[PDB]
Structure formats: structure tokens, C-alpha cells
Amino acid sequence: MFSIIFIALLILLITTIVMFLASILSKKALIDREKSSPFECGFDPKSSSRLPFSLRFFLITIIFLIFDVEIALILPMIIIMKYSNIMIWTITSIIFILILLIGLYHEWNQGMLNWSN
Amino acid sequence: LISDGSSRPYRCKIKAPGFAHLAALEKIGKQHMLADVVAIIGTLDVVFGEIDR
Amino acid sequence: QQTLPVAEVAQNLPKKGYSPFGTKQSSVAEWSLARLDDLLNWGRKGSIWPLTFGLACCAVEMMHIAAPRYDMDRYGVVFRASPRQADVIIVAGTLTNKMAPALRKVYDQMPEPRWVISMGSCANGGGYYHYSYSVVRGCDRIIPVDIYVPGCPPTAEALMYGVLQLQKKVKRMKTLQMWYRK
Amino acid sequence: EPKDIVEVPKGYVYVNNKELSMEFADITDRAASTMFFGELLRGFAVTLAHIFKEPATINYPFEKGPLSPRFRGEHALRRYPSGEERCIACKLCEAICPAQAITIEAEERADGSRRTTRYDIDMTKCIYCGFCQEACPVDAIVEGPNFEFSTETHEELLYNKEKLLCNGDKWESEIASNLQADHLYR
Amino acid sequence: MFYMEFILSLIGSLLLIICVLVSVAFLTLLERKVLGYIQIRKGPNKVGLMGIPQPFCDAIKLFTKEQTYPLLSNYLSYYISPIFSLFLSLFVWMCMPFFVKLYSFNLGGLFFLCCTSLGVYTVMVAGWSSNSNYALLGGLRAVAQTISYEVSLALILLSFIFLIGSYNMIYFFFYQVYMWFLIILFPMALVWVSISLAETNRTPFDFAEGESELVSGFNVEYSSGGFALIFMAEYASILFMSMLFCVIFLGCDVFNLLFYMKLTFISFVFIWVRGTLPRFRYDKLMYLAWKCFLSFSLNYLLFFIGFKILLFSLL
Amino acid sequence: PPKQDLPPPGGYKKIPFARVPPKSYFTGFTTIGTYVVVTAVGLGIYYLT
Ligand code: SF4
Ligand code: SF4
Ligand code: SF4
């Protein structure tokens, strides 16, 4: 691994050096009150502009986590399949996926993504 | 077009279809997604100049 | 007014060189700084990125140039939407009072070296609406214009000819070579 | 073809009356289209094909054109075949100029001839409409064919009579050609 | 001997880094040319000899262009994200397969999942540093796109993983030694193109940077040098996926030029999409991610798991 | 000869204004059945691999 670690450190150092170098290569200009404003198509930005956090994107990412963990559970099936007892490996894995489908199809009839808002 | 009898037009009001077509957007665009709004502006085909002049 | 040389005069004359500075530099520093300017100008000249402001009527020609008849990316020109990544601004159409502060803001949000082409008569001097209560008479009164492309609108050939003229201006700009004197 | 859904009289064409069949061959066709993106494949192959069409880019400025004899471009004040100024200061060109981009002041030259002193055009106000030349009674001023007249400074665009005369001298041959082409036709 | 081993491992990593960077920077031209001919344009043929040095020209412009840093104190945080993104897009290469040992990198598929995952943090913090609602919407839309597709991406992998019988990528070569693997898993290839295209944020799934809906998405508030790094990072990404498509479906023949012919064709195919498809909506894509792909992947998982059970039965 | 823009002798051939689809290479039955055939042969080859 540490061969990988050192290479990444080397790259990152070379990366920052390049961007550090470009920071000196690019000519400077006297700062301007307006040059450093948020871009709002050329009309003054409104109040703070911090978006509302009343929304669903956490909800989708929570679906991600559930399936992301479930993915973790099924990752090792590749290797153990040669070793594990076949009934248990067969049925056990099959019901994983089956429950996933039924969760999905039950959830389509729920249709939770088609929120009213 | 209103002519007062001279060689110079007296009043020339111009009704461009894009005018009314765009006013309805405030109602047409209700609740659709942002991407839908942009596509709605396109299908309105409200070319400019004719709207404000 | 001057005029082109005649056939025999051309025969006597040598190659016109490539770097517009020439190759008469005296010392090593002069000669070196001449080349670095040439490289810089070559970079800024070959790749130039309009902002596509394009308010009106003129904008249609601003699109025809992107069209495949007088191809402009052929020359290394691309329409970046974001002004932070756009290097040039082709102000085209009329500048009404509601727009004046917007154009100003867009201009200076763009980082330099920034060049402006005033396309069309409406931008050049207010064009056909010059004596109007709502129009900025010209766009010289809001921003520093660099190249004027007369026309109403300019034929696409005229526009991209002006682009090449901007490339020539970008080619002859003296920044390192003459910093050395500064 | 499937039947319609609204019966149409003439003078019209409904663009959606065609029914989406429920025949099994018809549904399986659509299903197979979605399962293997046949329509995308058709469009995909189109663009591959259309690489093999030669691009229509003019190698400007070497290759260039085309225009037509009536093209409205750089302005020019012509001169008679003797070399005398054609303009007589009749001032119609100014009177018609929609943008009011023309300014004229005329007097008598010492010979007693009616001629201009100042004759100014602002090609930051001109719209290249050509009303001036359509009005001039002696073809004094014309929309010459040049269109690459691009300047780095705004002041350089306001032409006066000296600049306009120079363009006329410079472009006289081409302008003569066009007028010979269009005078009897205009 | 041993230190011979280490020295070469570092030379190869370094050598690959310069090549992949110069390739993608130089590849940008091939996008500009190729797209130029999809459209009836002629594409860049002006600078140098036939626009060959066009991308070097571009870099010179950018690095000369100043760095219009946003609001006063953001200097670092705005200067971090481009580094932390180009780093991922490069370093993801080191897991790529060789017969000529670069690494003994096992769990390569896992590492693929991990690097492809880390793109979310780069884009999100980049938008956050920018502090402009335009940039912020782009980041959120960008985040949602990537995060949603990873779910399908994982299960899609597993189908191949089972079909090869390990997580070591190299076994793709041994199992493809007779007949290519696309011709077995044709539908997966179309889905995998879409997944890969979604990851690199190209169109039809162009919401993250996009245009005409967000000015440039998260990219909108980026000056030159940062922008060049982001732009290079994306193209290092588009190449790598093209490589991964090649090593999975199309032979994995690392020591055969035809493999590199296949690299170009696939990367071309990405462009071939760029100039053809229109863009999706937000919601329609999420349907396509969960309601279409996840179902698809699970079926093949349940299909191939049985197949390999039957295969194991036979032998 | 002509002195003014007029249509030539015989008028002009009618301009085509009719849509025309391309060759419809496959149908739902053919497409799916061919897909399964390919997959089945693919399974066999993978077995031997
Ligand atoms: S200058 Fe002419 S073409 Fe341009 S916006 Fe004005 S009227 Fe239109
Ligand atoms: S219309 Fe012709 S002749 Fe009369 S003033 Fe104008 S240019 Fe001179
Ligand atoms: S072309 Fe039209 S606007 Fe221009 S000077 Fe002639 S009459 Fe005036």
C-alpha cells in the first residue's frame, strides 16, 4: 500500500506546485469592489442567497445510504461462493435480491418520488 | 396606425404576439421544474425587440 | 493615407518577419523578452473566448458566425457562457438604461486582459435609436471599447474580420518586452 | 396506418390524430424500441453518416463570399468621368436619411458651382439602409461594396468628405461595375 | 532486486501521469475537431499546423489570465477543490490493469467504486466555496446526479465480478481470451455507457456544469487556473471510463495496439453522444436511475447468480 | 430570351414536401428473438472459456 500512499503524496505535491506556479504566472490586478461579487447574470445578488434546507435531497441520499449499505452486504458474495455451503449461499443471497425487488415494486405503487412537493 | 393627415404618422402602436404569449408565462410556469420553464420560454418563441420597444 | 507597395517593390523587400516586434533586439534580455511576449501573445491570440452577450437583432449575426459557413471555432474561438471563463465580450444590440448597469457589472466581473468588440451600429454609437430617451448613446459611455465593427448588422464576414483584427491587436501587445523598460 | 381520433375536414392537418395501436405486434415493437433504443440507434447512425459530408466553411480571408451587386457597405462619394465631384448638395440624402447620420453644408465654389463644403456621415448612426443612394439624383453617394472597415477607435468612424472622396477614388472600378449592372434595373 | 522494484513502480506512476495529462489536454482538440464534423463545421484547423497546438494555446491563455478570486477570505477554500478533484481523476488510474505489473492491486473494483464516489465532495465544496446561488444549485444538482447513479453502478459491477470470479480486474483478460464480453452482456454495455456518462457529467446527463439552465453550474465562479484544473480533471475522467469500458467489454488486451484503437473509439463514442443527444430533466433522470436501472441491475444479479450456481454445478 | 423573372418552360417540377421514413430493419419479434439467440450462444462460449 504505502507505495500507493507515497505516489499519491507525490502527485498531490506536484499538483499543488503546479497550481502554486500558475498563481504566480498569472498577472495581478488591483482589486475592485465589484469584481468580487457573486455572479447573478449581471443584476445585484439578493439577500444572503443561502438556499433553503427544506427539501428532499437528504431523503434521496438517505435512500442512497440504505442501498449503499445493502451493496456492502452483497459485495463478498463473489469470493465466498466457492467456499460456502451452496444451499445457504443460494437461498440467502436470493432472498436479499428478492426482498429488494419487492421493496422497490411495493415502493413504486407508493410512488414516493412523485411527491406533491 | 393613426394618421393626422400630414406626412408624419401620428401614432404607431405595435401588437407583437410575444407580448401576450409571455404574460401568460406567470401562470403557465406554475409548479413546473426549472428546466421546464426554460423550455417553455423556447416554445413561446418570444423573440425580443417586438416585446419591448 | 498610404497604399500597398507595387510588384517590384515587394520583390526588393524581404519577409515581413513573424513577431510584429521584429528581430532587431540588441542584448540577450531584450531578445529573450521578445520571444516570451511572442509566446504569450500567441496563446492569447489563438484561443479567445467570447461571452455571447448578444442583446438583439445584432445577436443573430453573432450566431451565424458560430454557424458552419464562416466557422469561428476554426480560428480558436469558443462561446463560454460564464463570464469568469470568457476572455472577450461582443457587445451587440442596443444598450438601454435598464441594461447599462448590467453591462458594466458583467464587464468588470470578467477578469482581464479583457477586450470588447462593439458590434453593430446600435452598440457603436446608439445606432438608429441614438436620439432616444432610453438608450445609452453608444456603449463607449459604459465600457472601454476596443474594436468597432460597423454594420446594421455587420455581415458575418465583417464581424469575424474584426475578430482577426482583434487577434492582430492581441498579437502586437507589448507587456514583458516593455516592462523591461518600466 | 391506425385510424384517426378526430375527423378532419380539408384546409387542415391534425398532427396527432393518429392512434397508438394496442395490437400485440405494435406494442412489442415499441417495447423492443425502448429495450434496445432503436430510435437512438437511428439517430446515432445519422450523425456518424453525416461526418462523411464535406464541411461548408469558407477559408476566410483567402476564400470568401458570395455577395450580390446590390450589397450595401462602405459609403463613397463618386466622381464624374472627368473627375469632377458628382455631388451638388441637393441635400435629399440628408432629408431622407432615417438615422439622420448625414450633415451637409454647401456654398458656391469660386467658379460659381453649387457644391458641398462639409459632407459628413456617421457610420455609428448610419443603418446602411441605402435610402441615401436611392434618393440621390445624380448617384453622388453610394453604398460601396467594402464591408471590412473596422476601427479600433470610435472617432475613426465619423467620415468627412475627404475620407468619403478617398473611398470613392479607391473603389471606383467596382462601383462602376455594379451600377452598370443595376442602373437599368434599379 | 527489491529497490529495482520500487524505483520502477514510481517511474511508471510518474510516466503515466505525464502521459495521461498530456493526452487529455491534447484529447480536447479531438473533441473540438470531431464535434466540428458531426455538426457540418470544419473544427479548429487554424493554429500551428491544422490546429494541433490548440490545447497548448488554451493552457497558456488560462495561466496568463488572472485569478479573479471570489470574496476576500475564500482564497484557500476556493483554491482547494480544483486540486482535490484533479487528484482523484488522475490517481484513479493507478488501479487500472496491466500484465506488466504496475501494482498487485487487488480489490480493484472496490477501489474503482471508491474513487468514483469521491467526486461528490469535490464538486459540492467547490460550489460551497464559490458562494453564488447559481454555483450552489449546480453543486446540489451535480451531487444528486452522481450519488443517484452510484447505486446502479455498484450492482452493475457485481454482474461482471461474478462472471469473472474475483475482484481482481486482471481476470477480465483471462475470461475474454476467446470471445469478447460485450457480445454476452450487450444490454449492460448500453447501461454502463449511461452510468459512465453520468459520472463524468457529460450530456445527456449534463446537469452539473451544464449550460443554458445554469450558467456553468458549480464552474461558474471559477477563474483561470482553477478552471483549467477542473476542465482537465473532467477529461482525465472521461478517458478513464473509456479505458474501463475497453478493459471490461472489449478484450482487456493491454499489450495489443488494438486496445488503444479501442480506447480512442470509445472516447470518440462519448463525443458522438455529446453532439447528438438532448438533455434530461431532473426528475426523469431519477426515475431512470432508481425506477429503471436499479430494477435492471437486480434482475441480472439474480440472473447471473443462478447462472454461476448452474455453472458451478456443472464443474 | 427572358427580360424578367418568369418560370421556365414546362413550369417547375413539384417540390417534394412529403415525409418518408427509412428502412425499418427489425420488428419486436425479430429484435428480441435475435437478442436471446446471441445471449444463449454467449453463455455457451463463456462456459467453454
Ligand atoms: S445595429 Fe442594426 S443589426 Fe444591430 S441591433 Fe441595431 S438595428 Fe439591429
Ligand atoms: S443626394 Fe446626392 S447630390 Fe444631393 S446632397 Fe446628397 S450626395 Fe449630394
Ligand atoms: S444608408 Fe440609410 S442610414 Fe445610412 S447614410 Fe444612407 S440613408 Fe442614412
Side-chain angles (χ1 to χ4, degrees):
Chain A
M1 165 173 72
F2 91 94
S3 47
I4 292 287
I5 299 176
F6 183 67
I7 292 296
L9 281 150
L10 172 148
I11 290 147
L12 197 152
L13 172 53
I14 294 304
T15 305
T16 51
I17 286 159
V18 170
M19 191 284 259
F20 172 99
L21 171 59
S23 304
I24 191 72
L25 284 173
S26 286
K27 58 170 163 162
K28 321 301 178 279
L30 314 196
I31 309 102
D32 292 331
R33 306 177 43 91
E34 176 74 13
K35 182 183 295 188
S36 53
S37 280
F39 178 53
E40 298 291 339
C41 311
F43 273 73
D44 51 354
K46 279 303 181 184
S47 313
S48 310
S49 68
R50 194 274 304 147
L51 279 69
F53 292 164
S54 172
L55 72 165
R56 285 74 54 193
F57 283 50
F58 54 73
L59 197 150
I60 295 88
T61 61
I62 287 150
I63 303 159
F64 181 76
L65 297 177
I66 297 302
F67 281 155
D68 183 38
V69 178
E70 301 265 320
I71 286 151
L73 305 178
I74 57 167
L75 292 203
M77 301 185 27
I78 174 65
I79 310 105
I80 60 170
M81 183 278 288
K82 319 294 178 59
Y83 294 68
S84 172
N85 175 13
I86 296 88
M87 281 66 88
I88 311 312
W89 187 87
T90 291
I91 294 89
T92 302
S93 288
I94 281 157
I95 61 175
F96 274 101
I97 297 89
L98 287 172
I99 291 154
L100 270 295
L101 272 79
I102 297 303
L104 186 60
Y105 293 170
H106 167 73
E107 198 274 322
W108 292 353
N109 186 284
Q110 274 276 4
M112 197 57 244
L113 189 154
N114 311 331
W115 51 70
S116 59
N117 197 4
Chain B
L1 196 64
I2 296 153
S3 170
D4 62 353
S6 83
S7 65
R8 205 189 311 283
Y10 188 87
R11 167 62 186 191
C12 173
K13 208 280 199 193
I14 316 186
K15 192 271 194 186
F19 210 91
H21 282 226
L22 196 146
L25 175 77
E26 297 148 2
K27 173 169 178 295
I28 295 153
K30 294 303 308 312
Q31 316 320 319
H32 310 281
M33 283 324 315
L34 176 140
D36 311 339
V37 165
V38 162
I40 286 156
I41 296 305
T43 57
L44 287 174
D45 182 18
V46 169
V47 161
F48 267 80
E50 72 178 358
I51 321 297
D52 53 353
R53 71 286 184 193
Chain C
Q1 81 89 27
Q2 71 167 22
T3 51
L4 280 71
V6 73
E8 166 51 19
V9 174
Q11 173 55 92
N12 289 115
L13 268 68
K15 282 276 167 53
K16 200 152 190 172
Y18 172 81
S19 73
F21 313 141
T23 62
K24 279 73 67 175
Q25 291 83 4
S26 62
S27 293
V28 162
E30 275 71 347
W31 188 85
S32 56
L33 286 150
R35 296 299 83 71
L36 289 189
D37 267 334
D38 202 359
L39 182 55
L40 285 172
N41 306 4
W42 177 78
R44 299 177 206 180
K45 183 194 85 178
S47 66
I48 300 158
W49 285 349
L51 183 49
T52 73
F53 205 48
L55 270 43
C57 180
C58 313
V60 181
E61 292 304 19
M62 200 268 296
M63 299 173 29
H64 263 288
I65 178 59
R69 172 55 59 81
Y70 313 96
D71 203 7
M72 60 155 257
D73 65 2
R74 189 251 186 184
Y75 297 84
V77 185
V78 177
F79 288 169
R80 290 303 320 177
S82 57
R84 299 285 191 174
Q85 285 87 18
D87 186 74
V88 161
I89 182 168
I90 301 169
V91 59
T94 53
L95 271 286
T96 63
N97 297 339
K98 275 203 174 299
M99 181 75 58
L103 179 62
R104 179 73 258 180
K105 166 164 178 206
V106 174
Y107 172 89
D108 72 317
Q109 269 178 331
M110 183 198 329
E112 64 85 20
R114 42 167 183 261
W115 306 289
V116 191
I117 303 97
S118 287
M119 187 169 96
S121 304
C122 275
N124 287 322
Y128 181 74
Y129 293 156
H130 179 91
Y131 303 99
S132 178
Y133 63 87
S134 72
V135 168
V136 185
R137 285 133 202 81
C139 68
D140 286 357
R141 207 168 301 97
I142 308 293
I143 65 146
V145 175
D146 203 339
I147 295 295
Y148 299 85
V149 179
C152 180
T155 187
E157 292 87 321
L159 169 53
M160 53 78 87
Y161 166 82
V163 161
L164 302 181
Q165 273 321 310
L166 180 60
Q167 270 192 349
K168 294 170 188 301
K169 201 160 185 178
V170 178
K171 191 171 73 182
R172 74 171 169 276
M173 65 180 288
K174 301 165 203 308
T175 182
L176 273 294
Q177 173 177 347
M178 180 282 263
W179 160 79
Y180 182 73
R181 320 182 189 188
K182 288 189 77 180
Chain D
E1 196 212 329
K3 72 172 193 171
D4 62 339
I5 197 182
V6 173
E7 200 72 6
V8 310
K10 282 65 60 174
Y12 296 101
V13 175
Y14 283 67
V15 304
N16 294 111
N17 273 344
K18 314 151 301 304
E19 277 194 347
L20 281 169
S21 162
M22 60 286 278
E23 211 285 345
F24 195 93
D26 292 331
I27 289 172
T28 188
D29 178 3
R30 292 178 280 275
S33 188
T34 60
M35 184 75 183
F36 305 124
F37 303 149
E39 73 305 353
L40 306 192
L41 292 174
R42 170 50 66 185
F44 274 21
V46 162
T47 60
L48 182 44
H50 194 191
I51 296 296
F52 304 147
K53 273 283 281 190
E54 287 73 3
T57 65
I58 298 158
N59 188 13
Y60 187 100
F62 310 93
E63 311 176 2
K64 159 179 140 291
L67 301 184
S68 301
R70 303 181 223 186
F71 178 67
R72 316 212 282 272
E74 179 78 328
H75 287 70
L77 283 172
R78 297 162 29 66
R79 306 167 91 93
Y80 278 112
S82 68
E84 177 50 42
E85 313 171 1
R86 273 172 169 288
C87 173
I88 50 169
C90 80
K91 276 169 158 174
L92 283 167
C93 54
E94 179 187 10
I96 185 59
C97 177
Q100 287 189 10
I102 309 182
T103 293
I104 306 181
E105 293 82 3
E107 306 188 354
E108 289 69 355
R109 185 158 62 240
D111 67 343
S113 304
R114 183 198 177 87
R115 292 285 193 288
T116 67
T117 69
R118 156 184 281 160
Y119 186 101
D120 292 331
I121 307 172
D122 180 325
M123 270 84 68
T124 67
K125 293 207 304 195
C126 169
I127 50 165
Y128 311 71
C129 80
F131 284 21
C132 49
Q133 65 158 63
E134 271 158 11
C136 175
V138 307
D139 310 338
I141 180 170
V142 295
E143 306 283 325
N146 179 8
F147 55 92
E148 305 89 312
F149 57 111
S150 164
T151 72
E152 313 98 358
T153 62
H154 183 201
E155 295 94 342
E156 276 167 350
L157 283 172
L158 315 191
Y159 287 18
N160 63 6
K161 183 165 54 46
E162 294 285 5
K163 175 64 169 181
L164 298 160
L165 288 173
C166 179
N167 298 124
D169 298 337
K170 197 181 78 170
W171 286 111
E172 183 59 14
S173 179
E174 185 66 8
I175 298 166
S177 166
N178 297 336
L179 290 159
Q180 287 190 36
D182 291 28
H183 61 281
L184 63 95
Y185 162 97
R186 55 174 48 254
Chain E
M1 72 291 291
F2 200 40
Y3 60 94
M4 294 298 102
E5 203 69 274
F6 176 86
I7 282 166
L8 290 187
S9 82
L10 189 152
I11 288 149
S13 309
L14 199 161
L15 195 153
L16 183 141
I17 290 151
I18 61 169
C19 284
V20 68
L21 285 166
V22 175
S23 294
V24 298
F26 195 86
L27 181 149
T28 303
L29 168 53
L30 185 142
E31 168 163 359
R32 215 168 281 169
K33 285 258 207 182
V34 163
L35 210 58
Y37 305 116
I38 295 284
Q39 303 158 3
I40 200 163
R41 280 189 283 110
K42 174 163 274 193
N45 66 275
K46 175 48 56 179
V47 295
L49 204 81
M50 318 303 99
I52 286 159
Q54 192 72 299
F56 309 118
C57 181
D58 214 341
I60 288 280
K61 167 176 93 72
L62 294 170
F63 281 29
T64 55
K65 195 80 159 97
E66 65 253 9
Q67 280 302 106
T68 175
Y69 86 114
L71 181 64
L72 78 173
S73 180
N74 310 333
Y75 273 111
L76 187 142
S77 315
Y78 163 75
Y79 269 38
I80 296 317
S81 312
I83 295 161
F84 191 51
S85 78
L86 174 54
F87 161 81
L88 303 170
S89 296
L90 302 169
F91 172 51
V92 69
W93 275 87
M94 321 295 178
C95 65
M96 62 96 88
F98 280 164
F99 308 161
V100 175
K101 178 208 158 47
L102 191 82
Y103 294 112
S104 164
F105 200 91
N106 208 1
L107 313 181
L110 275 155
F111 180 89
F112 181 75
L113 294 174
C114 175
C115 283
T116 52
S117 181
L118 293 174
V120 65
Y121 285 110
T122 65
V123 59
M124 182 185 157
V125 75
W128 182 93
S129 187
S130 289
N131 186 20
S132 311
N133 55 24
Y134 265 109
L136 200 152
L137 276 296
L140 293 174
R141 298 182 70 198
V143 164
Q145 180 194 351
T146 307
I147 294 299
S148 46
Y149 273 88
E150 293 179 354
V151 177
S152 43
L153 190 158
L155 313 186
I156 285 290
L157 263 182
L158 263 71
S159 293
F160 317 98
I161 294 300
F162 288 165
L163 293 154
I164 64 175
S166 291
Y167 271 125
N168 221 22
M169 304 283 211
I170 300 91
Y171 284 10
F172 278 110
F173 157 64
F174 307 135
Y175 275 76
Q176 278 172 68
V177 72
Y178 278 11
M179 279 306 212
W180 274 339
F181 189 79
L182 165 60
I183 201 174
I184 283 161
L185 292 202
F186 167 75
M188 301 275 317
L190 317 188
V191 169
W192 187 251
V193 160
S194 289
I195 290 160
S196 307
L197 210 54
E199 301 329 317
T200 67
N201 288 286
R202 282 261 81 72
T203 198
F205 320 120
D206 189 2
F207 299 169
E209 60 87 20
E211 281 94 355
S212 198
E213 294 294 328
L214 279 295
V215 171
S216 297
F218 56 88
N219 280 326
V220 71
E221 296 306 76
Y222 269 94
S223 315
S224 82
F227 174 73
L229 284 200
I230 293 158
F231 199 60
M232 284 183 320
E234 213 67 20
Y235 278 140
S237 185
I238 207 169
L239 201 71
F240 184 79
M241 295 296 172
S242 304
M243 183 278 288
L244 180 48
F245 190 94
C246 286
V247 302
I248 287 165
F249 296 116
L250 314 176
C252 189
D253 297 333
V254 297
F255 197 65
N256 184 228
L257 270 289
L258 310 179
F259 179 68
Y260 311 120
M261 295 298 102
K262 293 159 200 180
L263 271 163
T264 48
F265 184 90
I266 290 294
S267 77
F268 158 81
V269 165
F270 277 71
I271 312 316
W272 181 6
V273 172
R274 173 74 174 78
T276 318
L277 277 290
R279 300 160 74 187
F280 272 83
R281 298 184 201 171
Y282 177 90
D283 50 16
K284 302 301 179 60
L285 177 147
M286 311 295 178
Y287 303 170
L288 179 53
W290 307 97
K291 169 162 274 170
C292 179
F293 278 176
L294 172 56
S295 82
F296 170 104
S297 73
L298 284 173
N299 308 137
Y300 286 91
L301 171 43
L302 191 150
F303 172 83
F304 293 118
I305 190 184
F307 181 68
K308 175 66 82 176
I309 283 297
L310 174 47
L311 191 85
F312 199 97
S313 307
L314 296 172
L315 58 89
Chain F
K3 278 68 155 164
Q4 187 179 5
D5 266 317
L6 303 167
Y12 275 110
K13 300 289 174 57
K14 194 210 297 179
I15 296 90
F17 66 112
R19 193 82 178 283
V20 62
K23 180 79 79 164
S24 309
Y25 280 96
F26 311 130
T27 175
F29 306 119
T30 314
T31 303
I32 289 159
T34 47
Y35 163 83
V36 173
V37 171
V38 179
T39 298
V41 175
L43 292 168
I45 297 289
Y46 162 80
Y47 167 47
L48 300 162
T49 307

